[PDB]
């Protein structure tokens, strides 16, 4: 009924508070920014997902854009307030909107370390392997046989 009651409830961390927090962050972008903001892609808007722990979870594919590695790097998060700021974050500064480097037009979303290795290992041929020379009806049969 009053601001003091809401403050007390959020301090006590009631069950309804978590549901309210889930409701308010459904489509509210947050701006993630690294300390050295060399170029435009140093700050990008992301949709938040509530997680446990104490560390911000970042998408691997954007790391090359941030020049960030998981060796102890830190990031700052900002919350847009007005509707205009949220719409600018969703339409202009969203991660999906930033796919080409403004410096030269080259793409910025490329697999770096483990995706490339996994795809290379999966897409390889051995001249004598298990189940060689057989004929399959489709990719689903291949997945079934491999599993």
């Amino acid at each position: 009924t009053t601001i003091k009651a809401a403050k007390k409830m959020v301090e006590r961390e009631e069950a309804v508070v978590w549901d309210i927090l889930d409701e308010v962050i459904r489509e509210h972008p947050v701006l993630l920014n690294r300390a050295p903001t060399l170029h435009r892609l140093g700050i990008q808007a992301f949709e938040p997902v509530l997680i446990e722990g104490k560390a911000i979870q970042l998408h691997p594919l954007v790391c090359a854009a941030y020049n960030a590695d998981f060796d102890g790097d830190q990031m700052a998060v900002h919350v847009p307030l007005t509707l205009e700021a949220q719409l600018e974050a969703r339409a202009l500064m969203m991660s999906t909107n930033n796919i080409l480097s403004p410096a030269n037009g080259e793409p910025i979303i490329v697999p770096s370390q483990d995706v490339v290795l996994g795809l290379y290992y999966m897409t390889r041929d051995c001249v004598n392997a298990k189940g060689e020379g057989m004929v399959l009806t489709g990719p689903k049969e291949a997945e079934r046989l491999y599993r």
Partner: protein, 83 residues
């Protein structure tokens, strides 16, 4: 939900006034107590505004026309009440 705004961008065509139009529509819904032109799938005001912009139901000209119509009907109603 919404992941990209490319179709909305091409519907508007500039990506800068699209933000302004979506903000105006979101303010109309949130503050003016209007109703969405699309089914309300528990989405936020901005997402709903972008979604209804995508299929061409809302633009600058349409918003201006609706505002003019509302102003004219409110003026007619208040003139009738005065008389």
């Amino acid at each position: 939900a919404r992941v990209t705004v490319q179709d909305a961008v091409e519907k508007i065509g500039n990506r800068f006034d699209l933000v302004l139009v979506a903000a105006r529509r979101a303010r109309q819904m949130q503050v003016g107590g209007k109703d969405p032109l699309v089914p309300e799938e528990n989405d936020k005001t901005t997402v709903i505004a972008l979604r209804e912009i995508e299929e061409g139901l809302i633009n600058n000209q349409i918003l201006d026309v609706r505002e003019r119509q509302e102003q004219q009907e409110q003026e007619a109603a208040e003139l009738q009440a005065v008389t």
